């Protein structure tokens, strides 16, 4: 089997991407944030504290003839950005772009943190990291991909995120028309539960490539590109007037600037992030100070190849017995 679904930016800045997901019978379609940095499929629901729901579409398990409460199971998750959610668990039928999993754990939120409430466009998350990170207790549950894997034509999914435009998540096949040149594959460590890999270096603009190992995670659920302070400083030094602002929480730059591109290495291959991808707009409405899309990972404890990086590529998440990652230009 295969599946293919369009993923759409939630706003004009590509702060996140939502993908429609069918849950239950009859289908209840929710727009979920596909997150290769976590491993829970959780949804706003009829069980979510009413004051914490503000415009989201909810899953109502009592209206699904295939929903079954997973007795005694609870979940609770905290994300790198400080947000969190928790609740109980159903199993139900879940379909993405024509690919159907029966008995998928659907984690129903009883509580969500304010940032979730405040974002009306995201109805929940669909985790695509390794199932070892799943938070369901006392019996850990499998991700949608893990459940689908054996049925897929090939045990892979691909992320093709758009810049200010829709893109695609495919399951079970590689669309050879969706990228240019070849896909370069690179080793993955699953030891921390992530799609963790080592970039071979970077360049700023038309500058020389610096060969240096950068361990980080391919994370579709993180907006920005978080890299070591040395790398980030080298980037922003090429933007007149750019500075790190403790009050804002990162590098800012004059909105009048033209940003240089940023290249990262995948083996001997190179992925070029155009400068415009690194512009996250005014820090506050009407400001002429703009927020940067490349930020320091210092104090995160891990480098993160988030959407800023991934949307410059066609990305293969290869879930073979030994997982790997592939990157192509597009």
From Swiss-Prot:
Record flagged with keyword Hydrolase: yes
Residues at the catalytic site: 35, 199
Disulfide bonds: 255-290
Catalytic activity: Hydrolysis of proteins with specificity similar to that of pepsin A, prefers hydrophobic residues at P1 and P1', but does not cleave 14-Ala-|-Leu-15 in the B chain of insulin or Z-Glu-Tyr. Clots milk
Keyword Protease: yes
Known EC number: 3.4.23.22
GO MF terms held by the record: aspartic-type endopeptidase activity
Keywords per UniProt: Aspartyl protease, Disulfide bond, Hydrolase, Protease, Signal, Zymogen
Record-annotated Peptidase A1 domain positions: 17-328
One BP annotation, GO: proteolysis
Family: Belongs to the peptidase A1 family.
Name of protein: Endothiapepsin
């Amino acid at each position: 089997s295969t599946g293919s679904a369009t993923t759409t930016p939630i706003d004009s800045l590509d702060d996140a991407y939502i993908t429609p997901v069918q849950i239950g019978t009859p289908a209840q379609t929710l727009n979920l944030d596909f997150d290769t940095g976590s491993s829970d499929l959780w949804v706003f629901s009829s069980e979510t504290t009413a004051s914490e729901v503000d415009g989201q579409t909810i899953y109502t398990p009592s209206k699904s003839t295939t929903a079954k409460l997973l007795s005694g199971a609870t979940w609770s998750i905290s994300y790198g950005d400080g947000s969190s959610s928790s609740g109980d668990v159903y199993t139900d039928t879940v379909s993405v772009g024509g690919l159907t999993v029966t008995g998928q754990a659907v984690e129903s939120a009883k509580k969500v943190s304010s940032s979730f409430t405040e974002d009306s466009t995201i109805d929940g998350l669909l985790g695509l990291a390794f199932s070892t990170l799943n938070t369901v207790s006392p019996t850990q549950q499998k991700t949608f991909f893990d459940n689908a894997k054996a049925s897929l034509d090939s045990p892979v999914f691909t992320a093709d995120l758009g810049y200010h435009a829709p893109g695609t998540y495919n399951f079970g096949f590689i669309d050879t028309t969706a990228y240019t040149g070849s896909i370069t594959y690179t080793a993955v460590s699953t030891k921390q539960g992530f799609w963790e890999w080592t970039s071979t270096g970077y360049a700023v603009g038309s500058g020389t490539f610096k060969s240096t190992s950068i361990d980080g995670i391919a994370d579709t659920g993180t907006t920005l590109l978080y890299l070591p302070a040395t790398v980030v400083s080298a980037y922003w030094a090429q933007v007149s007037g750019a500075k790190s602002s403790s009050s804002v929480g990162g590098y800012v730059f004059p909105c009048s600037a033209t940003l240089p591109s940023f290249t990262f290495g995948v083996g001997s291959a190179r992925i070029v992030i155009p400068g415009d991808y690194i512009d996250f707009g005014p820090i506050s409405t009407g400001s002429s100070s703009c927020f940067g899309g490349i930020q320091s990972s210092a104090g995160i404890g891990i480098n993160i190849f988030g959407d800023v990086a991934l949307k410059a590529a066609f990305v293969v998440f290869n879930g073979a017995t030994t997982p790997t990652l592939g990157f192509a230009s597009k």
